[PDB]
Design a binder for this molecule. Structure first.
Ligand SMILES: Nc1ccn([C@@H]2O[C@H](COP(=O)(O)OP(=O)(O)OP(=O)(O)O)[C@@H](O)[C@H]2O)c(=O)n1
Ligand SMILES: Cc1cn([C@H]2C=C[C@@H](COP(=O)(O)O)O2)c(=O)[nH]c1=O
Ligand SMILES: [Mg+2]
Ligand SMILES: [Zn+2]
Lengths: 50, 79, 201, 249, 230, 149, 119, 87, 352, 228
């Protein structure tokens, strides 16, 4: 969606934005797994497990 | 020129005098409707005067000499 | 505000002797760069006085400056704004090159304004700049020992020291300048020795 | 919502007061894009008054910064809720959590100088999905004053005005609700009475040519500020007690 | 020139929305050449049908709220943007939707017009809360291409301004996602020979097969200009 | 904990991914950090800050144009900005900014007429601010006269 | 150089110096050039350093002095001296909205100074 | 107008009188009802000039035809309103 | 009415007409510059990157004043005196102010900098054209040692240029940059890994040898190639980039028991507040340098890459290290606070 | 579909080798779509002739030095890569170069051969230092396409490979450089519209104008599989 410049991070010393980005992708990673399981209906037992 | 005016500075020398001389010539074409020595090529009067200075056609001394000439022709006509 | 280039050449011989800023071992500012773009004053030739090397009123171009470095000239009287004779302004020659143009300054240029702006700008920019950008202070105070980088012989100018019972030269001058001379006999490193110092040699 | 949050998100959204929160709880009797009625549970429901809470939601209203304040219903028809549950979301709140903007797939890398000094390169998909699309609600007033020459009129009858312009004004001289407007369109027509307008020979010959003398009156109409463009959601009229009300009022 | 043409081999249709298309044999380097060139047209240039104008009775503007309806008009419009529509013959069709009583208003409540096909009849549009509440609207579906926003369309024609028409964004582009993978086609002699696997993901309307045909057609049309005029 | 969560998503522990340039189709020559940053649109829209003015209303005493977009104002040409023109050569640009562009009442109308006439000549005058200054100093009871050539 | 503008004078010349008047260096040099050729009473001089603020107020243009700082005091001292500002500096010309005596304006300004010699 | 220099000097009582076009005797600004300048007040038209271009206060002389025509009745010169910034 | 013919007339007027851009604060004269305007759809002013230095312009919402020089004289003073191109050097120092930065630097750095073997180590090409075709074909890397035959053009005693052809070891990348490099300059200019500091010298050199128009063209070319290769590379800033030295905790516990021993010696009697302040500041100041130099050895190189057979040491292509070494953005001081130790902070009084 | 076709507008031919081609009008995004697709075919798919194998007598490998010759064998081979050749009939031709005495050995010293045409006969190959030195070699030119290096030729073909046959990179593609620039074409109404500026640079065996025609032709031949 957005292309941000790497050179506005090490100078700025706000490393929070990069940790937010890594975790944000991990959060969305798990959202993408749940989206895939809901698209295929699957088991309430299996969704509950994951 | 088009991009940069360094060549026209190299002809006359003083950036300040370059501007006066290009101004004077552009005013002639702007008001008098003096015909340009270089093809216009859709160029504004500011750039044409700089072209003429670059190629070394326009100059403070040359402009003064031709001013005297047109002025003496008009004196001749009045008398 | 008033200071403007008024004349081309006042025809003055007078100027200030510029030497190379060689402070703290590594030359801080070379003489070449310090006299890069200034009007040379007084026919200054090479050691052997029997043939002129450099002329008088001549713009110090990068080429002249490169020649200066082969001969290793240390000191050069150059024409300056301060010593210019021009009344109600200054001469293009006393000033020298318009640093923004890369050639001799144009008569009519408002020099004073450019000077005030150029002294003023860095201060105003370095205020906001280093401050929002840094947090902590990265100073280094360990000004204990002078260690010399290249071999040579110790030269102490302006110094009055007393020998202590250790065998060692303990300095008691306030202004003390230890220099590092090579072979040929040029000054290359400097080192401000303080008061209360123990010299090794 | 923010995908990477802290937990203060919910606290801030609730305590700000911009969210409607349930005092009594119970089951929702009736949802609407305007109102929420909850039937209270007997355990908190007092035996004195009727036990039905009505929360009226505030719809699309102007802020001080001319941003938009809109409350939407969170819960569905016939949902059981406890005390301190979020019943309706305020403007920048997701199901109870505080949502100041929008999370995006971001990649750290240069583009062709399009992200030079902090400059941002965005995908068209962002614009298409109307993410970061925002609606502003600015209030404009037209004041009818009384001058030494005479009272100003809010008539649709305005000297020297196109029928294009007057199409959008109704009988009184007020724009219709729902009407889209753009800079220079007249919102409320007004005219400033002029006393003995001493025109010049050029104006006297002009006024003679079109014959549009148009009475002793000027044009001081409230018109949309230049370049700002949007839809009229609401109109309000404040009149003095004694003066005869407009048809539109 | 030992010219070596590819031909459409396998069409896995995982779903009406998602479809994978293997393509072989491709000569070395043509995998990425065709892969990206097609991806670009398939995203920017693909033609489709989408809701342009909506007129609800008793609704003057999109910011109001209708009684007996949970969703504000804006939210209803955003649901109509997601309404999947095929027009067979005409370029512009106006569908009518009249529904009453308690229930989720679905896309099936629109009067099925002869040529028009609603791909997702269960698509949610409106939730009716009170039984006395009735909603009636006329939804105009136009055919176009790419993405034409209501803001770009409120500064062009606007010959007639009927106080009561609501403009909503139209995603005429049927293609939602596209990626191409170059895999090796271990060919009889050549190991540099490759296959092109195009994973397409559309909404309704366009058929994957038909869309690829159209995109390759547009590219070949644009090449006629260069092969022809020198 | 974040890398452990990434493994649960089948995403890379580095949180860097292989990316392909949309234009060329070729891959970027090293992995790029991608993920989700929560982004905010601040109140500062270009729509609002954008302003431009050729000629407009003018101030009561000083006769200079007003300030601010709401008053349809000319940008302030400050001491700082003047000094820049002083450092350069630019004497006509400076006089312009002092006179026909600000106070000089006769000058601004005359030069407007010239620019529509396409003459691009200045014809400068006296800035009305200076006439005020004189009146303000004479109001103090100091005789301040213009001495002629 | 602008700091070392002024100079104090000892003794008299053919002008009005006497003990310890502070006059600008350029103007006393001008006097000394014509004095040395003609003779008259020779005048010993001594350059004075002025630090920036006072150096700017010591300028013989009172329009520049007023615009800088201390305007009330500058105008009382100029009003009492009956001081006449001939508008030589840049600030002075910018205030009256004229061509700067520098850059582009130096050509035109030097033409006016020679128009002072005749017509 | 084009001048050489500017001089500043103490104002004589009589110098001050020269610039003046009358003595303002009264604090009266304008009339509350006809918002026009009062007699010999601070905004007096008789002293500083006409409020409107080429028009006296009592309104007897109008238009650019009347030039410097000091109206006998109210005592207001028919000139431009610009004068009230200079007198 | 904003009629269509009006746009065409407006396009005709703006042609060759300079406009002044100004940014607050105007500290020095380059805070005003003239440009030839380019009519653009959209409400934002577009600024050339290389002049961002003089304005101190960064695009996180800064605004600029626009001014139109009206008279012919004012137009000429803007085009000759105040034009961007004509104000390349600063009024203070002789160093140029206009120079590529950020992406333009990152791209040229990525191109010039060398890697071990890579695709097509120790190959022979015939000029930079063969090198480029190889890189575009995808049979050679930008950082791979390759013998090439570049023909450099050196100025003689007169105005005539002398031509010299010779074989010099270089990367593919630097050969391709030679194509942008005007004739007159030596190939040694591009033969190093280029940073912002080297590129500034490159443009100054070109200005003093060749002149203004060539440096103008060369500057534009550098910008185009730099940004185009900046997107071709793909540098990113990961959390793993800032690698912490393994030996931080040791240095710190050592420094920490040391300062502790001097605080205990404070109650004893060898110490004033000033003496101990100096001694503690000295201990921590040396510790900070130690941890920083540990991080920078571990980060700057500590690249174990197997050369054509065995292992080698070479410079790290860690992203943050490249950013710092190129001079693109952060300095070693910032990266100390990222990956090393943040250090001694100083109070508003200035006392630490 | 409001289809919007481009047409070839300006062909600045700076030289027979270098030629700039502006193209308009193009719809948004088609600048890069057509720009890159063509760049890839013009580099890796333009068919042509080039030296593949070289056998010099008295030379067992490419790392040796022959006496009386300034250039090492590697540098000679690199000059033969730059040798511009057209074969008219055959796909593979072996040309013979025998020359002696002091002087720059040029491409004209190769024994003609009827069908084969050497585009640059003045092309420098070898400099002979001593007059007694004579150089003799058999240069094999094959027709192929794109860029086939010796490293990619040894990994695929592992058939006959005796010592002495010197393998050199064979730049079949007549295109030496290609770059495309997308500039804005301010169009009657659309500012979204762009122009495509293709800056080509061959050797002179193939004409840029004809090479562009050819590259687009190969592209349209691949679209024959997708029906229309
Ligand atoms: N009160 C201020 C703030 C900013 N500025 C000017 O605007 C510049 C940019 O300000 P800012 O963008 O906040 O600082 P940067 O150093 O660019 O840092 P960043 O944008 O990354 O925060 C400052 O250096 C300064 O020249 C100023 O003059 N006065
Ligand atoms: C806050 C502030 C900002 N600025 C300039 C510097 C950058 C832009 C944007 O400022 P912000 O992002 O604070 O305005 C200033 O010049 N002065 C100020 O006080
Ligand atoms: Mg900023
Ligand atoms: Zn009267």
């Amino acid at each position: 969606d957005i292309v941000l410049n790497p050179l506005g991070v090490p100078s700025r010393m706000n490393i929070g934005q990069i940790l937010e980005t890594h975790l944000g992708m991990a959060a969305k990673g798990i959202g993408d797994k749940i989206n895939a399981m809901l698209k295929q209906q699957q088991e309430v037992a299996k969704l509950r497990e994951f | 020129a088009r991009v940069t005016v360094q060549d026209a500075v190299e002809k006359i020398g003083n950036r300040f005098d370059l501007v006066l001389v290009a101004a004077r010539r552009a005013r002639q074409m702007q008001v008098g409707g003096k015909d340009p020595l270089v093809p216009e090529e859709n160029d504004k009067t500011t750039v044409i005067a700089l072209r003429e200075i670059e190629e070394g056609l326009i100059n403070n001394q040359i402009l003064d000499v031709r001013e005297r000439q047109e002025q003496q022709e008009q004196e001749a006509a009045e008398l | 505000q008033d200071l403007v280039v008024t004349e081309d050449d006042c025809g003055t011989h007078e100027g200030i002797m510029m030497t190379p800023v060689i402070e703290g071992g590594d030359v801080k500012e070379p003489l070449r760069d310090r006299v890069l773009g200034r009007v040379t004053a007084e026919d200054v030739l090479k050691p052997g006085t029997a043939d002129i090397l450099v002329p008088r009123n001549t713009l110090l171009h990068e080429q002249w400056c490169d020649l200066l470095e082969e001969n290793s000239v240390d000191a050069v009287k150059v024409r300056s704004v301060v010593s210019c004779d021009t009344d109600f302004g200054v001469c293009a020659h006393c000033y020298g090159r318009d640093l923004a143009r890369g050639h001799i300054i144009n008569k009519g240029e408002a020099i004073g304004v450019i000077a005030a702006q150029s002294i003023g700008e860095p201060g105003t920019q370095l205020t906001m700049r280093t401050f929002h950008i840094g947090g902590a202070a990265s100073r280094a105070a360990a000004e204990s020992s002078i260690q010399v980088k290249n071999k040579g012989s110790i030269k102490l100018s302006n110094v009055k020291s007393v020998v202590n019972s250790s065998g060692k030269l303990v300095i008691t001058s306030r202004n003390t300048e230890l220099k590092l001379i090579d072979e040929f006999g040029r000054t290359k490193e400097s080192y401000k020795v303080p008061y209360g110092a123990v010299l090794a040699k | 919502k923010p995908l990477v949050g802290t937990g203060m998100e919910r606290a801030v959204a609730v305590d700000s007061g911009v969210t409607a929160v349930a005092k009594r709880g119970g089951v929702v009797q009736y949802v609407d894009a305007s109102r929420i009625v909850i039937k209270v549970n007997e355990d908190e429901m007092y035996p004195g008054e009727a036990g039905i809470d009505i929360y009226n939601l505030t719809k699309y209203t102007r802020s001080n910064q001319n941003t938009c304040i809109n409350q939407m219903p969170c819960v569905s028809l016939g949902e059981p809720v406890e005390r301190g549950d979020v019943l309706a979301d305020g403007p920048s709140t997701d199901l109870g959590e505080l949502a100041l903007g929008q999370n995006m797939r971001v990649a750290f890398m240069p583009w062709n100088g399009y992200n030079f000094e902090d400059s941002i390169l965005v995908s068209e998909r962002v614009v298409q999905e109307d993410r970061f699309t925002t609606i502003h609600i600015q209030e404009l007033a037209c004041v009818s004053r009384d001058t030494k020459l005479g009272p100003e009129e809010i008539t649709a009858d305005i000297p020297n005005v196109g029928e294009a312009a007057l199409s959008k004004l109704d009988e009184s001289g007020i724009v219709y609700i729902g009407a889209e407007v753009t800079g220079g369109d007249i919102l409320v027509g007004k005219v400033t009475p002029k006393g003995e307008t001493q025109l010049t020979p050029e104006e006297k010959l002009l006024r003679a040519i079109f014959g549009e003398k148009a009475s002793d009156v000027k044009d001081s109409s409230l018109r949309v500020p230049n370049g700002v463009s949007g839809t009229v959601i609401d109109v309000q009229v404040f009149t003095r007690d004694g003066v005869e009300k407009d048809k539109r009022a | 020139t030992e010219f070596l043409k590819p031909r459409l081999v396998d069409i896995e249709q995982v779903s009406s929305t998602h479809a994978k298309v293997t393509l072989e044999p491709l000569e070395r380097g043509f995998g990425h050449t065709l892969g990206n060139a097609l991806r670009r047209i398939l995203l920017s240039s693909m033609p489709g049908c989408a809701v342009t104008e909506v007129e609800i009775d008793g609704v003057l503007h999109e910011y109001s709220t209708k009684e007996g309806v949970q969703e504000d008009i804006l939210e209803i419009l955003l649901n109509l943007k997601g309404l999947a529509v095929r027009v067979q013959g005409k370029d512009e069709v106006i569908l009518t939707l009249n529904k009453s009583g308690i229930g989720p208003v679905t896309a099936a409540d629109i009067t099925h017009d002869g040529d028009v096909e609603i791909v997702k009849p269960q698509h949610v549009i409106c939730h009716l809360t009170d039984e006395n509440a009735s909603i009636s609207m006329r939804i105009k579906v136009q055919r176009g291409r790419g993405y034409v926003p209501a803001s770009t369309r409120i500064h062009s024609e606007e010959d007639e301004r009927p106080i009561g028409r609501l403009l909503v964004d139209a995603c005429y582009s049927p293609v939602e996602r596209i990626a191409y993978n170059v895999e090796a086609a271990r060919v009889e002699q050549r190991t540099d020979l490759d296959k092109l696997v195009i994973e397409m993901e559309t909404n309704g309307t366009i058929d994957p097969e038909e869309a690829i045909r159209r995109a390759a057609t547009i590219l070949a049309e644009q090449l006629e200009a260069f092969v022809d005029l020198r | 904990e974040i890398k452990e969560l990434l493994k649960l998503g089948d995403l890379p522990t580095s949180g860097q991914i292989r990316l392909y340039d949309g234009r060329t189709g070729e891959q970027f020559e090293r992995p790029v950090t991608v993920g989700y940053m929560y982004m905010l649109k601040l109140n500062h829209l270009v729509d609002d800050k954008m302003h431009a003015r050729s000629t407009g209303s003018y101030s009561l005493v000083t006769q200079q144009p007003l300030g601010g977009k709401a008053q349809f104002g000319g940008q302030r040409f400050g001491e700082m900005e003047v000094w820049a023109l002083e450092a350069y050569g630019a004497a006509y640009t400076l006089q312009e900014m002092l006179t026909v562009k600000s106070d000089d009442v006769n000058g601004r109308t005359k030069m407007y007429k010239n620019i529509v006439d396409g003459n691009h000549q200045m014809e400068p005058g006296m800035p009305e601010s200076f006439n005020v200054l004189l009146k303000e100093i004479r109001s103090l009871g100091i005789n301040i006269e213009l001495e002629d050539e | 150089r602008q700091m070392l503008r002024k100079a104090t004078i000892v003794n008299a010349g053919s002008s009005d110096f006497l003990e310890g008047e502070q006059v600008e260096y350029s103007r006393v040099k001008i006097a000394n050039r014509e004095l040395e050729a003609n003779g008259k009473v020779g005048a010993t001089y001594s350059r004075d350093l002025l630090g920036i603020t006072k150096a700017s107020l010591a300028t013989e243009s009172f329009i520049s002095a007023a615009s800088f700082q201390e305007t009330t005091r500058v105008l009382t001292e100029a009003a009492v001296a009956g001081k006449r500002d001939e508008l030589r500096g840049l600030k002075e010309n910018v205030i009256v909205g004229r061509l700067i005596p520098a850059g582009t304006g130096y050509a035109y300004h030097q033409d006016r100074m020679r128009r002072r010699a005749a017509g | 107008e084009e001048f050489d220099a500017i001089k500043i000097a103490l104002a004589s009582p009589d110098m001050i009188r020269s610039w003046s076009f009358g003595e303002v005797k009264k604090p009266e600004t304008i009339n509350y009802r006809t918002f026009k300048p009062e007699r010999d007040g601070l905004f007096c038209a008789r002293i500083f000039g006409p409020v409107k271009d080429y028009e006296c206060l009592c309104g007897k002389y109008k238009r650019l035809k009347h030039r410097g025509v000091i109206c006998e009745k109210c005592g207001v010169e028919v000139t431009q309103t610009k004068v009230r910034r200079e007198r | 009415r904003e009629e269509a013919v009006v746009w065409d007339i407006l396009d005709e007027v703006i042609r060759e007409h300079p406009v002044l851009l100004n940014r607050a604060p105007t500290l020095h004269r380059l805070g005003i510059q003239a440009f030839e305007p380019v009519l653009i759809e959209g409400k934002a002013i577009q600024l050339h990157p290389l002049v961002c230095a003089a304005y101190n312009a960064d695009f996180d919402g800064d605004q600029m004043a626009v001014h139109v020089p009206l008279t012919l004289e004012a137009q000429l003073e803007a085009r000759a005196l105040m034009m961007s191109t004509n104000n390349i050097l600063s009024p203070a120092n002789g160093e140029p102010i206009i120079v590529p930065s950020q992406d333009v630097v990152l791209g040229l750095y990525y191109m010039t900098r060398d890697c071990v073997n890579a695709k097509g180590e120790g190959m022979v090409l015939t000029g930079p054209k063969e090198a480029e075709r190889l890189y575009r074909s995808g049979l050679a890397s930008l950082h791979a040692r390759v013998k090439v035959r570049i023909t450099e053009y050196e100025k003689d005693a007169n105005g005539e240029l002398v031509a010299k052809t010779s074989l010099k070891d270089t990367t593919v990348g630097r050969a391709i940059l030679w194509m942008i490099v005007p004739k007159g300059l030596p190939y040694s200019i591009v033969n190093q890994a280029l940073g912002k500091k080297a590129i500034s010298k490159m443009l100054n050199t070109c200005y003093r040898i060749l002149g203004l128009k060539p440096t103008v063209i060369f500057a534009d070319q550098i910008m185009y190639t730099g940004f185009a290769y900046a997107a071709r590379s793909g540098a990113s800033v990961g959390i793993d980039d800032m690698v912490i030295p393994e030996k931080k905790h040791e240095i710190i516990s050592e420094a920490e028991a040391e300062v502790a021993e001097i605080q205990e010696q404070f109650q004893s009697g060898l110490v004033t507040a000033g003496e101990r302040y100096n001694k503690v500041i000295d201990i921590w100041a040396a510790a900070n340098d130690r941890v920083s130099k540990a991080m920078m050895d571990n980060l700057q190189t500590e690249t174990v890459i197997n050369r054509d057979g065995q292992e080698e040491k070479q410079v790290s292509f860690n992203s943050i290290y490249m950013m710092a070494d190129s001079g693109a953005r952060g300095s070693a001081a910032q990266i100390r606070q990222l990956a090393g130790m943040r250090g001694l902070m100083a109070k508003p009084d200035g006392s630490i």
